[PDB]
Design a protein around this ligand. Sequence first.
Ligand code: LYS
Ligand code: LYS
Ligand code: MG
Ligand code: MG
Ligand code: MG
Lengths: 296, 296
Amino acid sequence: KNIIIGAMTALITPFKNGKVDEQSYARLIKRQIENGIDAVVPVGTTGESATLTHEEHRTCIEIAVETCKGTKVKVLAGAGSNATHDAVGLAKFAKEHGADGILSVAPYYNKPTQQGLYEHYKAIAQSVDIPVLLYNVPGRTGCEISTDTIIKLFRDCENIYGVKEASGNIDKCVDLLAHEPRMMLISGEDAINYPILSNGGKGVISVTSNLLPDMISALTHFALDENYKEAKKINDELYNINKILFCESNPIPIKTAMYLAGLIESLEFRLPLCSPSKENFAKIEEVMKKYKIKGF
Amino acid sequence: KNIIIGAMTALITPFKNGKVDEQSYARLIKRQIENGIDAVVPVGTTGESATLTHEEHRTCIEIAVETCKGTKVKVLAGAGSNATHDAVGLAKFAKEHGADGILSVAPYYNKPTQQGLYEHYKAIAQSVDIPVLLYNVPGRTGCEISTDTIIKLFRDCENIYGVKEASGNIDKCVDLLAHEPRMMLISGEDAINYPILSNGGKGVISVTSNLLPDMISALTHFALDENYKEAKKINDELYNINKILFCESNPIPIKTAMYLAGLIESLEFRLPLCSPSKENFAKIEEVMKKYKIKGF
Ligand SMILES: N[C@@H](CCCC[NH3+])C(=O)O
Ligand SMILES: N[C@@H](CCCC[NH3+])C(=O)O
Ligand SMILES: [Mg+2]
Ligand SMILES: [Mg+2]
Ligand SMILES: [Mg+2]
C-alpha cells in the first residue's frame, strides 16, 4: 500500500474580515515545510471544516497542494462528512486537484452503525485511487469505528492504509497493531504522541505542531528511528503545552497561541466558535513562555 | 412568550429510488394530524437531516406547512446546524415559508464553548420573530448546553421559549424547572416521556409517535391534564417499543418499523445510515406485534 506517515500538521484556517486569509494560509504552510514537517492536513477539525463553505474547503486544499509542489511535503486533504455522498465528493475533488491522500472523519451526529461505517468508507475508498486515512474521534462524532471495523476496511480496501486515533485509548492501539501490524496507526492526540509511536504507530497529525513544528517533527523522527529516549524527552517537555491547547475546544486555544505568537493577524473564529475566556487567554500566554516559538 | 407544546412527532423522511418520497411524506403527516398530534417536526435527527440536501430540507418543511394548513397542528421546523451561518439561514427560511417555530440542535462535532452556544443561539433568535426551541442531545453532538446557558438564553432572547432535552438526565430537568419554571421543557427521550411531563414538562418530540401517534398523544394529554395515573400507564406500556426503537441508532429502527407496518414503501436510508442487522430486524418485528398500529 501507498502511505502518508511521519510528522503532520492539522493546519489552522486563519480568517481576516470574515474571509479565509489565503496569503496567511500559504505563509503558514511554508513555515511548516521549513521546520521539518512531513505532511499537512488542510481543513480537518483543527481547520474549522464545519464552518467553511464547500467553496472555501476546496480553496484551502488547492492552496496546500500548490504550496507543497517541489518539496517532499505531502498533502493529506481533510475530506470527511457525515453524509457519504458529500464525503465521496470531497474525496474526488482532492484526488482530481492533486492531493496525496485524504483524511476522512467518522460521520458525526447521525451515529451510523458499524455496518454503515464500513459502507461509508468503502464508498469513499472505491471512488479514488489515493491513500485514505480513517479518523476516529468519538468525543466529537458520538461514534466509534471499532477495531474490527478498522481492520476489515484495511484488509478489504486497497487504499485504506491506517487510522488517525483521537480517542485516548492506548489499549485500542495495542489491539489494532497486535491484530493487524501492517496498518499505519497515526496519533491524533498530542499528549500521547510518544506512547503511540513507541507501540509502532508511524506518525502524528498534530495540533501543537501549528505552534511548535520543529519539536513535533523531531519527536516523530526520533521515535521512528527508535531513539526512544530522545522522543520521550520531547513528549515530556511538550506535555504542558499539549494539555493547555485543549483547555477549551480545539482550535480555540491553538489559534489563540498562534495569535499571541504573532503568526496570525487576528483572533477570528466563525461562530459557534469564539475566542477563549480571559482566564484561558492568560493561561495559554503563560504556558507559551516555556517554549521557543519559531517565526517565519 | 409564544410557544409550541404538546405531543409532537419527529417525522421520518421516506425515500423512494434515492429521492424524497413527497406524497408518502404528506400522507404520513396527515396520519399524525388525525391521531391527535399537536405539532410535527420535519427534518430533525429522526428525519435524517444530515443527509438531505439544502433543497430537500427546505422541501420537507414546505410539505409539512401545506399539509398542516387549515388544521391546528403546528409545524416546528428542524433548522439546526453546527455552522451558525447555516442555522440562521434555515431559521429565516422556516419563518418566510410559514413554520410556526423552529427546532435548533446544539452544534455537533465542533464542540463550541458555552459562550459560543449563547452567541450561536442569540444569532438565530435575533434573525426571526417566531419561537425557537433549543435542542440538547450530547450523545450525538459531543457538547452540552448547560442549565445556566439555557436559562440565560431563555431570559435574554424573546423567542427562545424552551428546550428539547434528549440527555437522559432527569436531575437536569429538575434543575431547569426549579430555577426557571416558566420555560417549556420538551421530552426528546421517549422512554422517559412521563417522568419529564410529571415534573412540569409541557410536551414531547417523539420518535415512537411515528408508529403510535395515538398512544403518544394520549400519554401527553393525560399528563397535561394531570391524570398521571393514566399517563404513567401508557408510558409503562410503551417502554418495550420505546427501547427497541433504539436497538440501533435512530432512525434505523423506526423506519424499519414503519416499513414493517406497511406505512412506507421502501426500507431506504441515505448512507452512512443503512438497514439494521437481521437479528435487530427480527427483534423490532417481534416487539411491534404487542401494539395496535393505526393505519391511514
Ligand atoms: N457544517 C456542515 C457542512 C460543512 C461542509 C464544508 N466543510 C458539516 O460540518 O458537515
Ligand atoms: N451533512 C451536513 C449538511 C446538512 C445540510 C442539510 N440539513 C450536516 O449535517 O451539517
Ligand atoms: Mg464560499
Ligand atoms: Mg535516521
Ligand atoms: Mg480535536
